[PDB]
Amino acid sequence: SMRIDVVTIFPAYLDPLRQSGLVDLRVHDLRRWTHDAHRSVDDAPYGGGPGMVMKAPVWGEALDEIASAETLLVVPTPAGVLFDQATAARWSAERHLVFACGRYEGIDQRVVEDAARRMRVEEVSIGDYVLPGGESAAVVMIEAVLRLLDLEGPSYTRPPSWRGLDVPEVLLSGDHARIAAWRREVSLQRTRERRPEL
């Protein structure tokens, strides 16, 4: 069985995701580990720079409560190692995943350094683009993992002819040999046109 905890200042973001007891998905509001009247999670950055940084004392207390030595802590961040299918498969075998969702300029770096003293930590980027926070990236990563727990060629369905566009004749032939050769030909051509580096 697998437990997945998501810590965020926007718990409603994980509402779409929330049938059996295989996965236990919990979402926590980071502000429940604050102690001031304003329930603040951020402060001005050291060394100048724009925006605010998320405070370590709040995150440290949150992870002490939720995480254990067996937890794999994931921190969605643009500076992380790229997320991929091999990572999703690797994570589907984990007993406890914790997603620490940051906002503003991100979480104070000492949170990950301190957390690594008592669990495994992975800073991960879903791709080379900038998001306002880690919540949408956690949703993408969780969906890739849940799908495993339970270039590609073109797909066609009825009718055989639509708006002057026909389904490739080979797909209607029934010839298993010709169909396999066509599928290899179309996937290779699409990979050459769109992802020649891959």
Specify binding-site residues.
102, 126-131
Computed from CA positions of residues 109, 105, 141, 4, in that sequence, does the dihedral angle turn out positive or negative?
positive
Phi-psi region of 114 (alpha: psi -120 to 50; beta: other; left: phi over 0): alpha
Annotated binding site for S-adenosyl-L-methionine: 102, 126-131
Classify 45 as helix, strand or coil.
coil
- Say if residue 100 is exposed, middle or buried (CB neighbours under 10 Å; 0-12, 13-18, 19+): buried
Of residues 3, 1, 7, 2, the one with CA closest to residue 138: 7
**Backbone breaks in the chain (C–N > 2.5 Å) follow which residues?**
18, 150
